[PDB]
A paper describes a structure:
pmcThe Omicron variant of [name]-[name]-2, the causative virus of COVID-19, was initially reported from South Africa in November 2021, and quickly became the dominant strain worldwide. Compared to the original wildtype (WT) strain of [name]-[name]-2, Omicron has 60 amino acid mutations, of which 37 mutations are in the [name] protein, the target of most COVID-19 vaccines and therapeutic antibodies. 15 mutations are in the RBD, which contains the [name] binding site as well as the epitopes for 90% of antibodies induced by infection or vaccination. We report the structures of the Omicron [name] trimer on its own or in complex with [name] or an anti-Omicron antibody.
To determine the structural basis of higher affinity of the Omicron [name] trimer for [name], we solved the structure of the [name]-Omicron [name] trimer complex at a global resolution of 2.77 Å. The other two RBDs, with clear density, are in the closed “down” conformation. Particle classification revealed that the majority of picked particles (~70%) do not have [name] bound. Monomeric human [name] bound to immobilized Omicron trimeric [name] protein with approximately 6-fold higher affinity (KD=2.5 ± 0.6 nM) than WT [name] trimer (KD=14.7 ± 4.9 nM). The dimeric human [name] bound to immobilized biotinylated Omicron [name] trimer (KD=0.3 ± 0.2 nM) with approximately 9-fold higher avidity than WT (KD=2.7 ± 1.4 nM). The [name] bound structure reveals that the Omicron [name] trimer contains an unusual RBD-RBD interaction and extra interactions in the [name]-RBD interface, both of which contribute to the higher affinity of [name] to the Omicron [name] trimer. We suggest that in addition to destabilization of RBDs in the closed conformation, the RBD-RBD interactions that stabilize one RBD in the open up conformation within the [name] trimer, may act together with the compensating mutations in the [name] binding site to contribute to the higher affinity of Omicron and this likely plays a role in its higher infectivity.
Numbering used by the authors:
A (entry chain A): 685 to 723
B (entry chain A): 917 to 1144
C (entry chain C): 724 to 833, 844 to 1061
D (entry chain B): 1110 to 1144
Write the structure that this text describes.
Amino acid sequence: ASQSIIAYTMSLGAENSVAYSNNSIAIPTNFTISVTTEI
Amino acid sequence: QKLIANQFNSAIGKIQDSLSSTASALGKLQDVVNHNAQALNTLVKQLSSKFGAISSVLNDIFSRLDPPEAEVQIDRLITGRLQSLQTYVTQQLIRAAEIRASANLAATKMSECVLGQSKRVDFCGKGYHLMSFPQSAPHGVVFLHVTYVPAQEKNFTTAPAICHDGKAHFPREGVFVSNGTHWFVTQRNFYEPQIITTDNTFVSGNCDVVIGIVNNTVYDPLQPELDS
Amino acid sequence: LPVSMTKTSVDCTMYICGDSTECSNLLLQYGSFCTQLKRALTGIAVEQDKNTQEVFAQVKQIYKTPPIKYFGGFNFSQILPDPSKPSKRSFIEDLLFNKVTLADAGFIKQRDLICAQKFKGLTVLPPLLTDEMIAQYTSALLAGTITSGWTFGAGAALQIPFAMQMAYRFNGIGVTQNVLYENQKLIANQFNSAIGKIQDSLSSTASALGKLQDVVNHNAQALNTLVKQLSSKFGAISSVLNDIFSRLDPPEAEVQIDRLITGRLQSLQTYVTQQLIRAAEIRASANLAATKMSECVLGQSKRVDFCGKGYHLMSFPQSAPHGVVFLH
Amino acid sequence: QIITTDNTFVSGNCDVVIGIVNNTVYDPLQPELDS
Ligand SMILES: *[C@@H]1O[C@H](CO)[C@@H](O[C@@H]2O[C@H](CO)[C@@H](O)[C@H](O)[C@H]2NC(C)=O)[C@H](O)[C@H]1NC(C)=O
Ligand SMILES: *[C@@H]1O[C@H](CO)[C@@H](O[C@@H]2O[C@H](CO)[C@@H](O)[C@H](O)[C@H]2NC(C)=O)[C@H](O)[C@H]1NC(C)=O
Ligand SMILES: *[C@@H]1O[C@H](CO)[C@@H](O[C@@H]2O[C@H](CO)[C@@H](O)[C@H](O)[C@H]2NC(C)=O)[C@H](O)[C@H]1NC(C)=O
Ligand SMILES: *[C@@H]1O[C@H](CO)[C@@H](O[C@@H]2O[C@H](CO)[C@@H](O)[C@H](O)[C@H]2NC(C)=O)[C@H](O)[C@H]1NC(C)=O
Ligand SMILES: *[C@@H]1O[C@H](CO)[C@@H](O)[C@H](O)[C@H]1NC(C)=O
Ligand SMILES: *[C@@H]1O[C@H](CO)[C@@H](O)[C@H](O)[C@H]1NC(C)=O
Ligand SMILES: *[C@@H]1O[C@H](CO)[C@@H](O)[C@H](O)[C@H]1NC(C)=O
Ligand SMILES: *[C@@H]1O[C@H](CO)[C@@H](O)[C@H](O)[C@H]1NC(C)=O
């Protein structure tokens, strides 16, 4: 519609909160094999 | 095995799509050529400077001025071009030190990830490093880091040890989890529940020294085959 | 470990010329020196932010801490950020920020300071990542390391009790899990007594943060030896530009002002070469610091004397001025 | 060495492994199982 230059505060990332507890562990049930390119 | 092979082939086939597009993947190899070409084009452009003389050309000075006064201005160009060549050689030495510091890292990566398996975190990919596949590149190298990324997590209730007969049972290579009613033993990186037996755990101590211990029956594969 | 440097920008017409003379027309006889110097300086300024983005921006998810703080008897009150202070730093990072005496640009207003070298054409560029963002990268790394372990650096964040996380990390050095669960209170008291002696070891001997003071001292000494070369005449009659035009006359004025212009250009080239050498040193130090962060904070390294003197268990990062401080 | 149930472990049935070979596993209890 109206493209323009905008200034903003640099975002660091998503805000996550790990549910820590005295008797809670997390074990995955699946996996994902990914290939990462390093130049 | 077939799901692992399909994920491996689908992860290879996306590298072609990621390298065919986005126009800026091999930027680190392009900057090496673009810095040397810029340093050479700066070197051919500093020959048009007079450096305080009357002409940048060396031919129209000796045919213009006499042997004595020609010298004052020939030296002004000579000490300017020698300084430009010295700056070019110094910047080329610094860039060669940078390329040496990058090539040492590339050689250590080729040693520790292509010729073996590395236990270092985030040295050869974001995850658990399985394999590394090098590929040929102009003025560089390209590594294909096969990694192991866990997914589809599930949260249970855990415990440090098990109280069977007043004895503490710690896991050997696993961890105790609970689905609400029973307790199992599970690997740390994949959900594979098993019955808590005497072969999965070991006995060390009693039931009042561990903070957070629970009560469960520890199985044994001998007493079923001993009572009958 | 030093991570970043103070970014500097140099103007040619204010350093070589005296910003009020007609010698800018004589500066074009030399040609493309200033373009190459500004390109090298902007490359250094880009690399000084690339070093911080490689060291501190490891994770992409900002992890938070639970409100109730019980981790099996361990006390992380000196590394977790203090919500009472407006800088949102920890109790250790405040001591690290009050020991490095650099010129902070946090003052609102603008007998002269050491920032009077701006008048000679030597400005200071602010970094892209502020200190309040490095303090939030450090908090996001600490809230992943305490609550998850090594799982937040290799995939999804998997929660674990800290008493079971330290029992996991004891297995990597050759110690079984039964030593922790029978002596958990002694381990927690030893960890608390070792963290409490960190601030006592940083409030003494006046040289615990010398590697972060030496880079600021070198950045000040380079600017001081750059502004001290302006008083040198390089063999001419004076170091003042209009005094040569007022004293002598055209034919011999240019034979006495090119000796100053070439000398100032040589001093600027020397400053740029020394800043390029220091940028390579700080880039090597920042690559080493990023490797140390990835191998000691985001996991457990079995290397000898890489993550401290002894068998490495865990590492905690701290935000530092122009660097990073690890707690091994 | 002989496959003697202390060098191996059991996990699932033998119909999902591609390339399995039928052999015997020597239980070291049944020769000494006099009771
Ligand atoms: C927790 O896991 C156990 C073991 O898998 C479950 O027990 C089985 O439940 C199924 C379905 O009710 C029964 O057919 C089996 O006979 C049970 N086996 C045993 C040994 O009891 C249990 O139901 C699970 N609990 C929850 C809440 O999921
Ligand atoms: C695990 O089992 C033990 C018994 O083997 C429990 O200890 C008992 O606790 C009750 C409640 O305080 C006491 O009245 C008994 O005298 C205890 N028995 C013994 C032998 O000490 C223990 O509470 C159980 N733990 C859990 C979490 O259920
Ligand atoms: C973690 O350590 C800090 C520092 O020793 C503790 O804070 C002190 O607590 C005592 C007890 O009330 C006070 O007298 C001190 O004035 C506190 N010092 C500071 C700097 O705040 C804190 O209590 C400890 N927390 C836990 C859970 O052990
Ligand atoms: C391994 O042993 C199994 C069981 O003895 C074999 O399965 C039998 O194969 C024969 C020949 O094809 C069939 O007639 C039977 O009906 C099968 N029995 C069962 C229970 O499936 C299997 O072929 C053997 N494999 C090898 C490679 O020797
Ligand atoms: C357990 O996992 C589920 C699904 O990811 C999530 O919604 C829930 O908040 C988790 N609970 C805890 C205590 O971690
Ligand atoms: C863990 O135990 C402590 C001490 O009993 C308690 O204060 C804390 O709330 C517990 N944590 C959770 C998540 O329940
Ligand atoms: C794991 O993921 C793959 C691909 O997404 C899927 O085919 C498979 O069924 C999944 N396995 C489990 C146990 O969820
Ligand atoms: C800019 O000017 C305003 C008002 O003149 C003043 O309040 C403010 O502090 C100034 N900022 C700087 C950075 O000088």
